[PDB]
């Protein structure tokens, strides 16, 4: 077929080869575990004798020749174009059966795995191909676990190809097992392979899953829900202050979290949107919150350095005044009465806004909401109204968790389903037309 | 009724476990029965420990600690395969061993610690690695063989301990005979030093060991040196370089202390 | 359980029989416990015989004969301490012409069709040593030179008299009592 | 729980809390679901926030087929509707994205030419809307990891956007930055002819410049007016939002145009210099879905809120630290709590094998690799993994093994190798040694006493990566041994008590996962010899109180143990016997 | 080659001198944000000597510019931080390093 003879004249025994391959795999099938010890040992003896006879008659090179002569065709469609369509139907199956037969021939036989070292280099050259990756990886695993000589010929290029298999094909634990077998064989450590695997896999931090110890971050908000809409009796310009009574810069090995600003709700639900209801995420870690930490402006989990007189991270006796303007979308901050040289502008105004603070352990802060809910240290800018003016008449202002679960006893924990939309926040008087 | 002793407690516990359940793990069975035998063979612990016991003066404590650290590095190199860094570490450790005074003052401690055996397994590994592919890391084998010859020259009992491993050395006598600048640093040199000037060891020498050297000499006299002709040397029919080394080993085997061992 | 572990270890296929300290200790313990030792009375001698039968039953009822056959078979004709302990244990369980043990040993061999056992017996017979004039003369010269031997044994001449005697005593105990079946089987 | 519905579930961890169990359930033999438990049951609830996951092969609506790229074509990922034209089909917008992002440059610099292709950082993919799929229902562009907006009616005006305005002292805007999670265009407006085309399917081409952050779109060979400028280091996921109006909706064409790299070059590092387009199996189509669970944390931050006074306002105070271990998926730019791997099997298995590889690379005294690994797995993470009671068993065992191998294995192996040798200096403390502590012949506690035999020296190096000295590479990295010792004693004390109850809640899920790693760490520390005097006394009381009474709580030796635990107990007893033998040898030398 | 921002102010009048040891707590991050080192994790304050070629040049110059009690952010461009070879298994080649360093004490 390679020399391009007529396809019909060429006798290609696909069915007999497939059935013979199945019979050979059954013949070299390893003993089962549930069998009694003596019978299992007898079957192991028979299998080892069969493997030795096959290797002495040189049936491994024949399988390698068949595999090589089948890899000349890129795909099953190409094989069905060159040879018959029925042959192209089972090209993939024949390749898989041949690889399984090779693995069965060499498995558990140290002499066979040692004699396969010469062909080991030829084997890895086709690892990238999707039609043979699993079979080649299994054969590689068997050779590596049995023969210490193969670890002597495995080089930097082979290790890098095995590693790039992880990058191209994804997370496969069998590649990790092969890499582990490359390190230690029969209680002997391979320093060169260990160094190469470490230096070629670890520094990237792009394939293996990464771990880090993260502080929990909680959020507290007042009752007020203020928004902007057409024909709504709602003041669009609000102001409030925060006082830091105490903060520990490092309660743990990780820096203390303390961010203040505004957050928005998705739609008219009172429910903070765009972020996780628990974790290490605070104000500014999503596109619904807008935070200030003393040195940076946080929004969408991206921080930008903002200039301020004697700029510093939030410390004890620091007063942060937050200004929200909904007529023209604008969020501005002033630290200790000095203007922070930065602004959030042109953000979504479809939802409802509320003050919010995010913190980790080691925080003592106070909300100054104006009136009888804290006295402002500084003058509100002209136009801006105190946040306590937004409370509904009957409702009582209180600072509560942004999310609906806290630390408490499990059987006393209140499980909450979805609740109704907070449409009553915006009073749009809609009379009938006359 | 309380056990009151670790030995009694272990003896009760192992039997109780075994008679309570049919243990499926052969490792667990082996561990339990080894521990039970240790409990019932308290004498054997002392019998095995006392040969491994050595006392030293207070003056040489730090020197012995340094020697033990070196030997620990040497032994830890046995669980990793050869590389250039391993060669460097082993060579430095061996240099430290000879620079150590305890190595000379206490040959019995060195023999009890299994130092010469450890060096021999290191040499076994390097020689078995690519034996047909020509010896790799030759300065490694040279340092090991020089160390082993010096160990032989230290004392007669050390010489007998090395003579106990003569068969392997004669198996690997053909390591570096042809290569010059390796004179005095080969397994054949170690074999010669194991029998040198010891009349008792020369008498204890056997006939198959001599026959091995004789067949090597016959091979060198029949066939040329492949490595030598690979470098361009003219292809004579025989191997004088290796023949002379086998001849001098036979000279040390047959001649001792000025007389001729007729046997 | 211990005898089963030892039997399974022997039955596992390996290129060579590894020296096992556990086996070489517990086989010795079992062998000593067997016979566990001027004119005596007939009742006393018969009572000793019955005690020996009970002590041998404690072992061969739990599969000791099969284990000592399997160890010899797995030895593959290589002389060693493992075989030396196995032969001693076989002698201990076979002392007195134990017909039950002889029958168990013959039945196991006939059932399993073990050729390795007899091949290992032939190899161990070939490996047995005899008197050595060369070694004796060398040792005599070494002593006459006046210098004390490094080892006090000096047992190069007639290397393993105990091992040879144990092997042939085992083979004799296997046939004691005019055991025609096993006599023909050998 | 439905809308505005509040309920409570009581699992009967405390039977007194249950109110009707005695009336109906105590006599019938029913047991509370949390009767034999020591810690609260982890509760999982439905996730509110949609996430992108690979399209399942059994999905009843969406089908994805991978079309290999021929010589005259390019690799294509085709999205088709399985149940179009039939009853009960779903006809809402369905959000799609590719599994791997394009990362922009860290710093933005202020036929086809092969050199230009080698030096350029511009990447391209195209989407073909099949003729018959309504194009105004299809959007093409890029999204970031922050996109979680599942709206039935989607339009380009409702995307989440913000403009961070940075100004100088007086107020000059020296820079304005627009930030969003959706950079997409509509095919309906993209069409120049518009309406229905039938010459061919509409080809929308997306071009990204990783060095400048410029996003440009090409429709049918002409440049569209819409463009986007993104921030540095932004990760952009190719995405297509489409409402199905055809059995075949669209396809992801992964080809290339003149002077541009294929998308695979940007995606994969190994193919950074390969101009030939490729579609490796890692790249696959993902869709936004609501079918995911969320793990409610076992413990929450303790926050105190109260009104101090009218003038002082409301006080919010949090003081007690709380931490969790986060697992970060690199390709998805998403992080989850590692305790969520109790239900994510593939991630759990891959991470367990990653830990095994971490142990293997540093196995047998590879101190340089151990120092390198100390960066990836640090000691706070190790301590948290050791102490956590909700950790999966496989991860717990892997982290115990990693902690042993990185810091302790080298010295433990050295001191085991130097165990059967007794080099006893002859000093006054050596002479003071006797077989028995006092006049009566009563054995002292094994290990307790004065040992003078020479032992290997224990030395460690501080794992710092700002230093440039190479002397640190020798010697294993340092770890807090006193803290490890105290924690091990405390956890063993808890485990022995909890084992006697025979609860249904072992740490790690099984008794083996609870005991084998902890006892392995204890045995390693015992071999290393860190334990001294009182710690040895307490841990011998834990093993067996009655025998080791100071001079009947069931110790470790009698708790109906599994075989793996029994083997380690045998190892501990072997070490105790070795200690007794060493004491005997030292006393003999003293008498000598 | 090193830029410095102050996270928290220091005294501002005491600076490291020649051959004076610097006691610092530092946390090392890459530009992407991944943490590769931290003295706070080891709970062991880092001590090094100015002008003794003990640490990387970026860390050296940043600590020199820092005053006592000052917490500062240090970005080290690759030429002064491991160069193009990088650190095997930890730092990728040509990687910019960011350090959050606090000068605890001078001695």
């Amino acid at each position: 077929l390679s020399k391009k003879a007529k396809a019909s004249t060429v006798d290609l025994p696909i069915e007999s080869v497939s059935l013979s391959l199945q019979d050979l795999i059954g013949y070299f099938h390893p003993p089962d575990e549930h069998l009694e010890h003596e019978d299992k040992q007898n079957r192991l003896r028979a299998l080892k004798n069969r493997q030795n006879l096959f290797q002495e008659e040189g049936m491994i090179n024949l399988v390698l020749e068949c595999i090589d002569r089948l890899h000349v065709y890129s795909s099953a469609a190409h094989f069905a174009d060159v040879a018959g369509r029925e042959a192209g139907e089972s090209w993939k199956s024949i390749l898989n059966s041949l690889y399984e037969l090779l693995a069965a021939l060499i498995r558990g036989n140290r002499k066979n795995c040692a004699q396969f070292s010469g062909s080991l280099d030829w084997l890895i050259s086709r690892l990238e191909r999707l039609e043979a990756s699993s079979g080649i990886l299994e054969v590689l695993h068997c050779v590596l676990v049995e023969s210490p000589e193969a670890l002597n010929i495995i080089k930097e290029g082979h290790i890098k190809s095995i590693i790039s298999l992880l990058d191209k094909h994804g997370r496969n634990h069998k590649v990790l097992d092969v890499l582990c077998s490359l390190c230690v064989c029969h209680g002997v450590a391979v320093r060169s392979n260990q160094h190469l695997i470490c230096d070629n896999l670890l520094p990237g931090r792009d394939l293996l899953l990464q771990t880090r110890l993260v502080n929990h971050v909680s959020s507290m908000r007042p009752n007020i829900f203020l928004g902007v809409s057409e024909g709504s009796a709602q003041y669009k310009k609000w102001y409030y202050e925060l006082m830091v009574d105490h903060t520990e810069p490092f309660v743990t090995a990780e820096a203390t979290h303390l961010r203040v600003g505004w957050a928005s709700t998705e739609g008219y639900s009172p429910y903070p949107g765009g972020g996780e209801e628990w974790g290490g995420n605070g104000v500014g870690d999503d596109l619904f919150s807008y935070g200030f930490d003393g040195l940076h402006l946080w929004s969408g989990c991206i921080a930008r350095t903002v200039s301020s007189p004697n700029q510093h991270l939030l410390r004890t006796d620091d007063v942060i005044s937050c200004c929200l303007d909904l007529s023209a979308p604008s969020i501005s901050f002033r630290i200790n009465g000095q203007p922070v040289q930065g602004m959030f502008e042109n953000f979504n105004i479809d939802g409802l806004f509320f003050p919010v603070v995010s913190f980790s352990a080691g925080i003592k802060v106070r909300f100054l909401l104006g009136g009888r809910h804290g006295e402002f240290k500084f003058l509100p800018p002209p136009g801006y109204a105190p946040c306590y003016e937004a409370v509904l008449p009957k409702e009582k202002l209180k600072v509560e968790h942004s999310r609906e679960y806290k630390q408490e006893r499990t059987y006393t924990r209140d499980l909450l389903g979805p609740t109704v939309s907070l449409t009553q926040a915006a009073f749009t008087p809609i009379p009938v037309d006359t | 009724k309380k056990s009151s002793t670790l030995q009694q407690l272990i003896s009760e516990t192992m039997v109780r476990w075994a008679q309570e359940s049919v243990i499926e793990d052969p490792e667990l069975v082996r561990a339990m029965f080894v521990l039970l035998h240790r409990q019932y063979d308290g004498i054997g612990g002392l019998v095995r420990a006392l040969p491994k016991t050595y006392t030293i003066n207070g003056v040489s404590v730090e020197d012995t600690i340094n020697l033990l650290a070196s030997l620990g590095q040497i032994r830890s190199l046995l669980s990793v395969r050869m590389g250039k860094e391993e060669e460097k570490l082993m060579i430095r450790g061996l240099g430290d061993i000879m620079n150590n005074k305890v190595f000379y003052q206490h040959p019995n401690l060195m023999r009890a610690l299994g130092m010469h055996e450890t060096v021999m397994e290191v040499m076994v590994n390097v020689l078995g690695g690519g034996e047909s592919k020509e010896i790799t890391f030759p300065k490694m084998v040279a340092n090991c063989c020089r160390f082993l010859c010096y160990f032989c020259r230290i004392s007669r009992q050390n010489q007998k301990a090395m003579f106990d491993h003569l068969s392997y050395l004669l198996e690997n006598s053909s390591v570096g005979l042809a290569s010059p600048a390796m004179r005095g640093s080969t397994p054949l040199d170690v074999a010669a030093a194991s029998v040198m000037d010891n009349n008792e060891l020369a008498l204890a020498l056997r006939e198959p060991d001599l026959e091995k050297v004789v067949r090597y000499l016959a091979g060198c006299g029949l066939q040329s040196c492949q490595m030598l002709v690979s470098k361009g040397y003219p292809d004579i029919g025989w191997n004088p370089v290796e023949g002379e080394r086998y001849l001098d080993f036979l000279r040390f085997a047959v001649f001792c202390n000025g007389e001729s061992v007729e046997e | 359980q211990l005898i089963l572990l030892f039997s399974r270890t022997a039955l596992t296929e390996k290129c060579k029989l590894e020296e096992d300290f556990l086996y070489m200790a517990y086989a010795d313990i079992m062998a000593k416990s067997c016979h566990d030792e001027e004119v005596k009375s007939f009742e006393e001698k018969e009572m000793e015989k019955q005690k020996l039968l009970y002590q041998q039953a404690r072992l061969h009822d739990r599969g000791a004969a099969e284990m000592v056959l399997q160890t010899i078979s797995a030895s593959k004709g290589e002389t060693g301490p493992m075989v030396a302990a196995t032969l001693k244990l076989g002698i201990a369980i076979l002392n007195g012409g134990n017909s039950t043990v002889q029958q168990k040993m013959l039945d196991y061999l006939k059932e399993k069709k073990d050729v390795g056992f007899f091949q290992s017996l032939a190899g161990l017979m070939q490996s047995c040593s005899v008197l050595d004039l060369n070694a004796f003369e060398r040792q005599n010269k070494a002593e006459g030179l006046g210098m004390v031997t490094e080892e006090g044994s000096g047992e190069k001449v007639l290397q393993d008299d105990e091992f040879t005697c144990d092997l042939f005593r085992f083979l004799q105990l296997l046939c004691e009592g005019h055991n025609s079946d096993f006599q023909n089987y050998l | 729980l439905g809308v505005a519905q509040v309920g409570r579930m009581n699992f009967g961890k405390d039977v007194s809390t249950l109110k009707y169990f005695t009336i109906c359930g105590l006599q019938e033999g029913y047991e509370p679901f949390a009767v034999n438990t020591n810690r609260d049951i982890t509760m999982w609830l439905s996730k509110r926030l949609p996430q992108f996951l690979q399209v399942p092969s059994n999905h009843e609506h969406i089908e994805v087929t991978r079309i290999d790229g021929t010589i005259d074509s390019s690799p294509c990922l085709k999205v088709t509707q399985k149940s179009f034209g039939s009853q009960n089909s779903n006809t809402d917008i369905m959000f799609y994205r590719l599994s791997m992002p394009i990362e922009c440059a860290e710093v933005f610099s202020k036929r086809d030419d092969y050199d230009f292709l080698m030096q350029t950082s511009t990447y391209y993919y195209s989407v073909r809307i099949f003729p018959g799929q309504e194009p105004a229902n299809v959007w093409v562009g890029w999204i970031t990891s922050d996109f979680h907006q599942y709206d039935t009616g989607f339009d380009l005006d409702r995307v989440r956007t913000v403009t961070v305005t940075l100004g100088d002292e007086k107020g000059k805007v020296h820079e304005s930055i627009k930030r969003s999670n959706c950079y997409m265009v509509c095919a309906g407006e993209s069409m120049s002819p518009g309406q229905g085309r039938n010459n061919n399917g509409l080809e929308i081409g997306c071009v990204v410049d990783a060095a400048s952050g410029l996003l440009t779109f090409i429709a049918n060979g002409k440049e569209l007016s819409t463009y986007y400028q993104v921030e540095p280091s932004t990760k952009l996921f190719p995405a297509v939002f489409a409402q199905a109006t055809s059995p075949n909706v669209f396809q992801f064409e992964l080809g290339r145009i003149k002077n541009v790299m294929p998308l695979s070059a940007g995606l994969f590092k190994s193919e950074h210099k390969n101009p030939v387009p490729q579609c490796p199996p890692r790249l696959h189509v993902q869709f936004l879905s609501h079918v995911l669970w969320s793990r409610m944390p076992n413990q929450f931050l303790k926050v105190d809120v109260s009104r101090i006074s009218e003038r002082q306002g409301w006080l919010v105070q949090c003081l007690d630290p709380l931490q969790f271990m986060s697992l970060h998926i690199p390709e998805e730019n998403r992080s989850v709590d590692i305790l969520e791997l109790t239900e994510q099997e593939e991630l759990l298995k891959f991470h367990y094998h990653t830990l095994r590889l971490y142990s293997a690379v540093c196995a047998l005294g590879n101190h340089r690799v151990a120092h390198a690994l100390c960066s990836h797995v640090d000691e706070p993470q190790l301590l948290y993994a050791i102490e956590n009671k909700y950790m999966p068993g496989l991860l717990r065992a892997g982290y115990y093994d990693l902690l042993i191998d990185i810091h302790l294995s080298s010295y433990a192996t050295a001191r085991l190798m130097m165990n059967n040798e007794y080099i006893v200096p002859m000093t006054e403390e050596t002479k003071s040694i006797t077989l028995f502590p006092d006049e009566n012949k009563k054995h002292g506690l094994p290990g307790i006493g004065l040992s003078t035999s020479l032992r290997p020296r224990m030395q460690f190096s501080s794992p710092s990566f700002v230093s440039i000295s190479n002397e640190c590479y020798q010697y294993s990295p340092e770890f807090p041994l006193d803290i490890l010792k105290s924690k091990t004693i405390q956890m063993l004390t808890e485990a022995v008590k909890e084992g006697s109850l025979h609860a249904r809640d072992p740490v790690g899920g099984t008794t083996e996962f609870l005991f084998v790693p902890l006892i392995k760490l204890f045995y390693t520390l015992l071999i290393m010899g860190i334990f001294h005097n009182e710690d040895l006394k307490h841990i011998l009381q834990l093993i067996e109180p009655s025998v080791f009474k100071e001079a009947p709580k069931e110790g470790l030796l009698q708790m109906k143990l599994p075989e793996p635990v029994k083997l380690q107990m045998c190892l501990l007893l072997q070490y105790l016997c070795d200690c007794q033998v060493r004491h005997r040898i030292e006393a003999i030398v003293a008498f000598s | 080659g090193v830029e410095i921002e102050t996270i928290s102010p220091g005294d501002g009048r005491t600076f490291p001198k020649k051959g004076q040891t610097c006691v610092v707590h530092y946390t090392g991050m890459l530009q992407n944000g991944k943490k590769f080192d931290s003295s706070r994790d080891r709970n062991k304050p880092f001590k090094f000597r100015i002008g003794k070629q003990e640490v990387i040049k970026g860390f050296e110059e940043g600590a020199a510019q820092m005053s006592l009690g000052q917490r500062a952010k240090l970005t080290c461009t690759p030429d002064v931080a491991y160069g193009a070879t990088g650190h095997p298994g930890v730092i990728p080649p040509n990687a910019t390093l960011i350090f959050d360093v606090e000068l605890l004490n001078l001695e």
Side-chain angles (χ1 to χ4, degrees), chain B residues 46-64:
Chain B
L46 296 181
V47 175
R48 287 159 228 141
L50 277 165
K52 301 294 186 291
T53 305
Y54 201 86
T55 186
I56 60 160
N57 279 342
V59 55
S60 66
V61 173
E62 69 276 15
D63 192 0
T64 301

Side-chain angles (χ1 to χ4, degrees), chain D residues 310-327:
Chain D
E310 310 299 326
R311 186 263 184 277
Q312 291 263 287
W314 293 73
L315 179 63
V316 160
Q317 168 186 334
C318 195
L319 281 192
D320 288 34
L322 211 57
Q323 277 178 306
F324 71 98
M325 183 175 187
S326 63
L327 192 73

Side-chain angles (χ1 to χ4, degrees), chain A residues 402-414:
Chain A
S402 303
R403 310 301 173 139
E404 63 183 2
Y405 308 108
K406 33 181 181 299
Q407 177 59 75
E408 58 190 1
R409 283 108 33 213
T410 60
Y411 77 102
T412 79
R413 172 157 286 140
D414 291 76

Side-chain angles (χ1 to χ4, degrees), chain A residues 57-132:
Chain A
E57 284 309 299
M59 298 285 314
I60 295 171
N61 303 278
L62 200 56
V63 166
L64 296 177
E65 273 170 353
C66 301
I67 285 164
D68 192 1
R69 290 205 153 79
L70 275 167
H71 279 291
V72 299
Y73 313 103
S74 48
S75 80
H78 182 199
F79 187 49
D81 290 340
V82 186
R85 188 270 299 164
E86 67 275 16
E89 291 178 353
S90 74
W91 173 85
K92 183 68 66 68
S93 178
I94 292 190
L95 284 172
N96 299 341
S97 280
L98 276 158
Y99 274 116
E100 195 182 344
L101 181 61
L102 187 62
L105 288 171
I106 67 175
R107 188 176 290 116
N109 205 304
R110 187 173 180 178
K111 182 260 289 181
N112 297 14
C113 279
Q115 306 259 341
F116 203 73
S117 62
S119 296
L120 185 64
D121 204 304
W122 167 94
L123 183 64
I124 311 169
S125 65
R126 290 177 179 84
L127 185 62
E128 69 275 16
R129 292 150 165 262
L130 194 49
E131 70 271 15

Side-chain angles (χ1 to χ4, degrees), chain B residues 7-72:
Chain B
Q7 164 191 101
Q8 310 196 28
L9 165 78
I10 292 171
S11 306
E12 286 153 31
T13 315
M14 296 309 113
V15 179
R16 189 179 44 89
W17 284 353
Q19 78 198 5
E20 271 172 349
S21 58
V22 187
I23 297 93
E24 296 295 328
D25 186 38
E27 270 79 8
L28 182 50
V29 190
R30 178 169 308 260
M32 288 176 318
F33 278 100
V34 169
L35 193 59
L36 190 59
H37 173 70
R38 283 195 56 180
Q39 301 321 304
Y40 273 91
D41 195 57
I43 285 300
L46 296 181
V47 175
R48 287 159 228 141
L50 277 165
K52 301 294 186 291
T53 305
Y54 201 86
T55 186
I56 60 160
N57 279 342
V59 55
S60 66
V61 173
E62 69 276 15
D63 192 0
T64 301
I65 293 170
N66 297 326
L67 189 149
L68 280 166
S70 296
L71 179 59

Side-chain angles (χ1 to χ4, degrees), chain A residues 191 194 210-211 299 407 418, chain D residues 4 179 300 328 364 366 381:
Chain A
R191 287 272 196 269
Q194 287 177 325
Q210 315 288 317
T211 59
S299 199
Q407 177 59 75
Chain D
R179 195 178 293 131
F300 287 90
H328 180 77
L364 297 173
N366 210 322
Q381 279 180 50

Side-chain angles (χ1 to χ4, degrees), chain B residues 27-178 180-184:
Chain B
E27 270 79 8
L28 182 50
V29 190
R30 178 169 308 260
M32 288 176 318
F33 278 100
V34 169
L35 193 59
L36 190 59
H37 173 70
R38 283 195 56 180
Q39 301 321 304
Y40 273 91
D41 195 57
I43 285 300
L46 296 181
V47 175
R48 287 159 228 141
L50 277 165
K52 301 294 186 291
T53 305
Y54 201 86
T55 186
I56 60 160
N57 279 342
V59 55
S60 66
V61 173
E62 69 276 15
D63 192 0
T64 301
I65 293 170
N66 297 326
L67 189 149
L68 280 166
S70 296
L71 179 59
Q73 291 157 51
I74 302 302
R75 293 180 182 178
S76 82
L77 284 194
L78 263 181
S79 294
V80 307
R81 186 178 296 116
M82 194 45 89
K84 277 306 165 185
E85 50 260 48
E86 281 79 54
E87 188 171 19
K88 299 294 187 291
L89 292 154
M90 187 66 204
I91 285 174
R92 188 269 299 164
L94 292 174
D96 298 345
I97 280 160
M98 285 100 101
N99 276 40
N100 202 290
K101 300 289 94 176
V102 171
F103 181 71
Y104 314 119
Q105 288 158 11
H106 302 286
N108 290 319
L109 184 44
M110 306 302 111
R111 199 181 331 123
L113 288 169
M115 149 187 313
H116 55 285
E117 285 89 2
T118 305
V119 170
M120 291 218 37
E121 290 94 9
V122 176
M123 182 179 72
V124 164
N125 304 329
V126 290
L127 289 187
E131 59 90 20
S132 70
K133 274 76 68 178
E134 192 273 331
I135 61 170
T136 183
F137 309 112
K139 238 178 359 180
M140 186 65 171
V141 183
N143 276 268
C144 279
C145 291
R146 186 179 298 113
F147 168 86
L148 281 183
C149 283
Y150 197 78
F151 188 79
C152 290
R153 279 182 262 120
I154 292 299
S155 178
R156 292 178 65 88
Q157 317 94 49
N158 290 11
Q159 187 177 2
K160 189 264 182 182
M162 280 291 71
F163 177 80
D164 300 330
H165 308 93
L166 184 62
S167 294
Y168 167 65
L169 286 158
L170 278 189
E171 291 291 329
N172 298 52
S173 77
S174 66
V175 173
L177 303 155
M182 184 178 232
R183 181 83 178 151

